[PDB]
């Protein structure tokens, strides 16, 4: 994995030694090259993972996430180009450095082979995100958003550290291969219940879970465009990856402790979709849609069947791409009119046709239009939940109906209707924005063409 790790640590000095007007070009070009290099990790085996060394290993679950991160970095660079025109050279270089450090930490987190190193890096990702939000946010609430985000994550994750060190002392090693081969059943006692609670609650707060999710709207609304792109697409998937990794040692207690979280996740899907129905802010709508999709992924992981993990992985990848595209579109509309109110600007299909097309495609992918990988993952999760019980079908059906409702509602509100008369600063869409949307959308269709690459290790 050093062939991918080192080029990022070379992106840092290149960014700091490049000329003032070449930083964006160099960063984008070399990020694209690193993504191309990281595409080689998709050649996974069928039985065991790729064990590069004692420290780093790659699996069919880690590879798509690494590819997604390496692909997402240059798009964040383009968005930063968009919204950081008047910043000074040193501050622009600091912003690029924060993005590069976040990508490096995410890569090492996904490829870590031990739970303690995974925890260290997964907590190390907090610092760049907090700095980005609280430093380059546009409104007053960015400080409160950063505080909520940081303290929710830490309050979740500290008992995870205690549980991890306890597990190492009890068993001998935190290496994932060892804890998988040497796994033993977990008895139904209070101590085991609390260890299960520690680990699961940490990853659920990171996920997030319904009732532990206010930090997500707070941080995503107030973060800059790059921060919102990385928060929704990759940083939300750390909880899912951890749960898919940490549940190896929590059986059979997971069969008994999953009920409260399953009920919370399903009713949270319903509640967050209903909230999306009546949101006056576009970014809040996108954030709550992200919450609903992550709740569905939680349901899949908790029911924990071979058909549910494949759906979970596919839905994670698809939701990451779709949410990034939606946030980019919302940011373009915001930068045109300098306001996040959804009903402020209308007639955007009359004023900007190509952006209307991008909005249509993004909203169709959001509501899981077949044969998109969004629908593939959702359908696998629904089938597994149906096998689990026969009322989950009712809950999933109503959630799907409300999801389509609010997706088409935001599409019709923003794009269709009569344009606002007094808004006369709607300039034609930039080639940069069009290319950003195209680079967001084309990989989704290509993964639809080849879906076996994002179905996890249980394929």
């Amino acid at each position: 994995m050093l062939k991918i790790i080192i080029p990022t640590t070379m992106l840092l000095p290149m960014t700091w030694m490049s000329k003032h007007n070449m930083i964006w070009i160099n960063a984008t070009v070399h990020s694209l090259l690193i993504s191309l290099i990281s595409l080689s990790l998709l050649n996974q085996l069928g039985e065991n993972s790729l064990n590069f060394s004692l420290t780093f290993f790659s699996d069919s679950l880690s590879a798509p996430l690494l590819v997604l991160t390496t692909w997402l970095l240059p798009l964040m660079l383009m968005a930063s180009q968009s919204h950081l025109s008047k910043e000074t050279t040193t501050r622009k270089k600091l912003y690029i450095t924060m993005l590069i450090l976040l990508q490096l930490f995410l890569i090492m987190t996904f490829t870590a082979t031990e739970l303690i190193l995974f925890y260290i890096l997964f907590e190390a990702t907090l610092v760049p995100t907090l700095i980005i939000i609280t430093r380059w946010g546009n409104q007053t609430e960015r400080l409160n958003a950063g505080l909520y985000f940081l303290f929710y994550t830490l309050a979740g994750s500290l008992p995870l550290l205690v549980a991890l060190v306890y597990i190492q002392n009890t068993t001998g090693s935190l290496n994932f291969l060892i804890i998988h081969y040497w796994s033993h059943p977990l008895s139904n006692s209070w101590s085991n219940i609390f260890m299960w609670l520690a680990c699961i609650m940490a990853f659920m707060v990171k996920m997030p879970l319904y009732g532990l999710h206010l930090w997500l709207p707070k941080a995503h609304v107030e973060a800059p465009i790059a921060g919102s792109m990385v928060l929704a697409a990759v940083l939300l998937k750390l909880g899912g990856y951890g749960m898919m990794r940490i549940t190896t040692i929590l059986n059979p207690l997971t069969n008994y402790m999953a009920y409260p979280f399953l009920m919370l996740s399903m009713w949270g899907m319903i509640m967050t979709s209903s909230i999306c129905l009546r949101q006056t802010d576009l970014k809040s709508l996108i954030a709550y849609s992200s919450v609903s999709h992550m709740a569905l992924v939680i349901v899949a992981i908790m029911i924990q069947t071979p058909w549910s993990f494949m759906g979970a992985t596919a839905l994670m990848i698809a939701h990451g791409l779709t949410s990034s595209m939606l946030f980019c579109l919302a940011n373009t509309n915001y930068e045109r009119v300098h306001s996040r109110t959804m009903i402020l600007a209308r007639g955007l299909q009359t004023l900007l046709p190509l952006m209307a097309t991008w909005w249509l495609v993004a909203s169709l992918t959001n509501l899981a239009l077949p044969p998109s990988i969004n629908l593939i993952g959702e359908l696998f999760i629904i089938t597994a939940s149906f096998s689990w019980s026969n009322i989950t079908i009712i809950l999933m059906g109503m959630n799907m109906m409300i999801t389509a409702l609010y997706s088409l509602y935001m599409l019709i509100t923003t794009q269709r209707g009569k344009y606002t008369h007094h808004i006369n600063n709607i300039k034609p869409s930039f080639t940069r924005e069009n290319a950003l949307m195209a680079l967001h959308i084309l990989p989704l269709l290509l993964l639809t063409l080849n879906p076996k690459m994002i179905l996890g290790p249980l394929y």
Binding site: M17, P185, N251, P252, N255, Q304, T305, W388
Partner: protein
């Protein structure tokens, strides 16, 4: 305190004579490289604080930073390796000396071992 009070321990000795039987760290050690990196970062921070060109001023003092960090890191690594070797030696000696406290257990194959099966449904 665990190691302090060990028999034969000479006080205020960074590296005793028995530590010379261990392989010295290689000069290309990743830990030594990280120590040199810390020295280089300290030099850059010195330039930044004193308001000098960060990457081009004070090359001699940056080199001195790197050299001092590498030197101290090398000696620290030697001491750390000696301490870990001593710990392993003492552990093995005690395990040898107390076989009734550290007994061998019978190895049963999984065909003989009975373990409960918990279905996932």
């Amino acid at each position: 305190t665990m190691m302090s009070g060990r028999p034969g321990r000479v006080p205020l000795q960074f590296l005793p004579n028995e530590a010379r039987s261990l392989p010295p760290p290689k000069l290309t050690d990743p830990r030594l490289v990280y120590m040199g990196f810390l020295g280089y970062c300290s030099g850059l921070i010195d330039n930044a604080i004193r308001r000098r060109p960060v990457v081009s001023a004070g090359l001699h003092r940056q080199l001195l930073y790197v050299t001092s960090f590498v030197f101290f890191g090398y000696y620290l690594l030697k001491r750390q390796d000696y301490m870990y070797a001593l710990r392993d030696h003492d552990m093995f000696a005690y395990v040898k000396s107390h076989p009734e406290d550290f007994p061998e257990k019978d190895k049963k194959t999984y065909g003989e071992i009975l373990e409960e099966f918990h279905p996932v449904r």
